[PDB]
Design a protein around this ligand. Sequence first.
Ligand SMILES: [Zn+2]
Ligand SMILES: [Zn+2]
Lengths: 747, 747
Amino acid sequence: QTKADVVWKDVDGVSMPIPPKTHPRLYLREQQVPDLKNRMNDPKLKKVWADMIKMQEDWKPADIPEVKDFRFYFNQKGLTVRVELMALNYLMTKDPKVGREAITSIIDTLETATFKPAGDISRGIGLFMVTGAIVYDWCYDQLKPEEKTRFVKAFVRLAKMLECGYPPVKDKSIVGHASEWMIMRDLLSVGIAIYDEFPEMYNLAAGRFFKEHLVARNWFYPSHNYHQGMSYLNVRFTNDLFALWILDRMGAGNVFNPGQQFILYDAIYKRRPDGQILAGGDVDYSRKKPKYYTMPALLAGSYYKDEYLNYEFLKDPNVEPHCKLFEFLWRDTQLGSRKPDDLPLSRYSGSPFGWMIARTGWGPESVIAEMKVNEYSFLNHQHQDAGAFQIYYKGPLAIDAGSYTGSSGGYNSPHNKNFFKRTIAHNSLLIYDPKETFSSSGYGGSDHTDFAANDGGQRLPGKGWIAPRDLKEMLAGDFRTGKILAQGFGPDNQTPDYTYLKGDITAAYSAKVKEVKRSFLFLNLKDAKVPAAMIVFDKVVASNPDFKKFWLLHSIEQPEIKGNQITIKRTKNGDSGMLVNTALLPDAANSNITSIGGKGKDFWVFGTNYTNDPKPGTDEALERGEWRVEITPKKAAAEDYYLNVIQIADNTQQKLHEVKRIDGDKVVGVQLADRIVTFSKTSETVDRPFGFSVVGKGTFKFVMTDLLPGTWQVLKDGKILYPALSAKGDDGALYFEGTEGTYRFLR
Amino acid sequence: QTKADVVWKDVDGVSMPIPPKTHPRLYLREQQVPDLKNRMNDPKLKKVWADMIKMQEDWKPADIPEVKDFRFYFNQKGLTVRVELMALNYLMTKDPKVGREAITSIIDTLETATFKPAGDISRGIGLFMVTGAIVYDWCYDQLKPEEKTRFVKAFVRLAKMLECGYPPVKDKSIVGHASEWMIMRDLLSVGIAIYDEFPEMYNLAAGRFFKEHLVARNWFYPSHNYHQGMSYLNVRFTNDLFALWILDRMGAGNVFNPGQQFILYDAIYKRRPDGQILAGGDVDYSRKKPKYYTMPALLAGSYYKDEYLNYEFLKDPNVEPHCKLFEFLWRDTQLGSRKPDDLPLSRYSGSPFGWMIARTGWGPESVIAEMKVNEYSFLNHQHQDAGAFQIYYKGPLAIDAGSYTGSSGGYNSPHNKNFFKRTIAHNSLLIYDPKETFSSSGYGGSDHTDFAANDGGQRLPGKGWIAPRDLKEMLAGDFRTGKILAQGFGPDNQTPDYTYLKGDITAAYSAKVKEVKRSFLFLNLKDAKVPAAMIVFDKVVASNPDFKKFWLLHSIEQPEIKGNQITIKRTKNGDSGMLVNTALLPDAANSNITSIGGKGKDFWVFGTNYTNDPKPGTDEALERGEWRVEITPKKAAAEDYYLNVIQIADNTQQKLHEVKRIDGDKVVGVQLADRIVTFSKTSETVDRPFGFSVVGKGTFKFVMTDLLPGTWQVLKDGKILYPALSAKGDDGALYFEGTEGTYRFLR
Ligand SMILES: [Zn+2]
Ligand SMILES: [Zn+2]
């Protein structure tokens, strides 16, 4: 990271940097060349250089798979590695002999190379381009004029092979393959190298990046999160960070919103004590080895000099072979590292997300709870999971169900289209319109189907479940799925007693609903015995009273239902957690609670089970799940409310807190332990006097929500208790402590 | 206060109550009649009744004044008192002789009474009408048919004499005389009384009230304040409260937004230790008798059963003669009372106000500070005072200058039109456009002036400085003067360390400015020696760099200027306060600080002194002021910033705090005592990394404003200090404690 010293020009209203008229300019400038010897003498970096020396050896003919995967090419070996090390040596020695060998060794094969149609072949093709780009840029003054021309024509030939095409007009700028290596690393790298001879490639590659990719990312970056789920976070954010490094090292400074530094903190918050990461979007499961975000933590931690991110990298400081050079060039070995233990227990991601991640600690006894609005849907690997909550404690308890791969297949599978990516897979809300259709004609790259199953769930946005080209198309289309209404945590910023999130998710559904709102209130109970609780309060108004309403709670093992109580336990894989839901609304007289699951019913969608068993040896804990509970109104009605209170504890915990519903004036609420929480009876803003009664011993902590921001007066037993308290705009809430009595509130 | 039990039907889209088919219905119904005996037996209420018995005596002919003022009539004596007591007695005894006597004693004079035209005479006419309405309603069953007709014609005759006219089509529904007794008490009372025989009067009076008055008041009531200044609060709010009591007692319940209860708390916050009230709008000054809000406190306190307001009534439980009956009927004598001592030290009034009142205590050592945005202007007795601050501590220190009356005259005086109601009289901002025109043709109804003086101040809204008819007309016009941008007070709700308010007041001025912003930060320093400080940060962008800019500070006595330091002291009237302003921006190299004042210069407006000496024996402390300081930039520039730090102490205090300006990355700030406060150097939202250095011993309290809401990271001496703090939407600020070092903030 250094200040920009390049010239900037507008191209069609969009400011862009001009590559400096000097080589090297790819991945480094002369400015950092003398530091290469220090890096070579850096013992942390010597090992990575040794790794690359080993990479110089050709593939053993018998070891070659013959189906040359993207993984084949990313496990980089042979000539391309050799010429890269030659170019590096030329930078450090300036010896005309070494720089020439790099050039003469690569040119012919760069012109002639062939690639059998194979899985993500663009990646191998793009990496082969990168090899040439390194030699071209780093040994530039050694190039003969005829060779430069030969290199250019070879690069154009190779570029045309890429899935984005050349010109790079195909695919999408926020998600999909064009949001991976092909543009942000590969085409951009070549462009920078050959700019003095063929400026077109840079103008096309950087052109699209600055116009689309950059604008789209800068839009959500301030909220410090990513939208492709907890696996594809890796490749997608890695390539964002490649563009960051490539352009800063070119001389363009940081081109992104610097909030980029804080995106990977989400992964940190979602890490479990078993080494796995809380689920979200397209993910598979394992208990074999911990999940790591090595490349993003390397690139982001080193650039932004972030100790929390460097800790993450140091967990497994082992970069994929094709990335070794980039670790050598860009890693900060002087940077320290910090365990996450002193991070606030709750973190909030605002627009366009509206996601809360709440913990009760950083150790083995941690409850980890996720609450999501989703203001927009990004599609691709994101799920239609507006309103979803997810809870982990000593095992996955309230689960995000299904699996990316399995017996059903991969991304294009019936399981993905009909269960995994759909609302029914999640702890959210269904409203079933028998006449609703779900257009899926543009989903996936093969095995296309025109329509998906009716899950009573959320819309499939886009032109048949097609992601938008860019931010412009996204904002103009039907990708809006919600509105964050309220959020906060406290009273303490470090160890909040409560974590609150409210969203209106009507836009996530068709016109089968008039209104859908969900309010989450997580309680850190500050107790080893019953460490946490979550209260979920829903308003659902269907356009037709006969549209069946569903409240879902997914689990791995079979739930036990007794009255208004659902008990879920983990008893396998060393997990011992327990979840207990008390259903308060609909009331027992209007409540049907039903469990669906087990063999043939694990992925049940209104008449069809979308079977997806794990690949042998994978998902040993069955985190894809086998069970769910559906809470449904007995009586058909346009307007229904759900109120559910979840307690979390060890499966050996016998005594859980008594849960009381509070039926007040204008409010409905919950009381358990020393906590009182209220919501508007209509889930709409309360702007007039209201009240309720409290019965019980000791001091209670009150969170009153859905209140008109401004000054409130609190009375108890007809006497003013708090003459003036402020409800603020962000949470629309009153907070205070008090004892039992009859409460009135004035505004 | 009882639940509504009458029928409602829409009239031209507006729901209105129908008077019940029963008498009595004026000021009480049958449900309250038996309780009259109990009230007569109440020691507190027997005295007011005895007061009324005394009022029965006629005026002494020699003591009758030449001019029958509104004060003459409100000092109600003779026949009209007698007949009201006869009617009360008829309700209580049901004796036909009594009811008949009330009717016969009043009927002749009611139809023949004459009132010499004066211009406040509507009040005496209206009260005479109320006397007749009492007899009519309370003795209804004793009325003969012929007498009913005589009463109706008499009431219509009297109604036509009122300023609003009959039909009530003249004047204004938010301010002016039609927002006083004539409709909300007087015409409404008669309408209700005679409804069975002549529903037209009620339909017109209540029709206008429900369509216009009620709508306007409900619109601003939730922010718990009033817009007519600290004197006219009395008559204006009193009449709102008459409408409240009249309509509830009729059977319509509470027709107002119940936020009405909290309006009078502002007066409580503005009370000084010397018994007077902080200035605002059209006010005069006395040190003789304390100012009381007796009638509002009686009516609001008793209706809403509010002990703080009842305390305010009990300070001086003496209502004007013409209101004694209403005390007898409506006073709650069982209600308790509370001194203001346990009230939070700061109170916020939101849209359409944006006012902070901040204190350091409730006793003799109280600092009292007012900070105002003004989102809308209501005109009439409100001043064009957007951005103004005012500070009291052992005397008026930073003053709201001028006086309502004096040698210049009253409401229509050149002093009112050219100084008192104008920005120049206030601690606010001037931008002088020499070509600017200020139309005042409609001021004072339709009075003669046409154009007022150029004070370089704020616009005169309306059709030549007149108020709009109602809310509809107000919102469609040019009455918007500002936008609340941010607000909040200190970590503790009860005793906040800081009180913050930011407003954009561009709308208050003409096109001579492109942008005007003012941020206030009040500090409660929690120290006897220097109790408080106020930091004021202004951004002013003029449309012409040659347009002279002014920052004003008004005082009673002569300010002492020394370099960048302005010292102001009170040494008279038993006052001993001191204000010391440190001018930080403009820098001393670009700052000119000039005192203007003394005789012939006390109300100086660019060449002309608008003289307004007190009436003999009034304003003995000269709170109208004699002096001001103007801070002006040396260099002509379109854009200028003002940064001023006011410290408050006893004038005997020799040691005040050193004030350091903090010149940071993207921020400009202030350091004094143990407090750090920063603003955006541009006064625009900061959304990228920034920082500054702190030198000094011990722990400091940091308030960082103008920040993009979301999660921020704090670093000190290159190490993460706070990994994650939240800036919230309402204040857009970070709060934390820290020691000396070099600070960086990431977003
Ligand atoms: Zn999912
Ligand atoms: Zn004023």
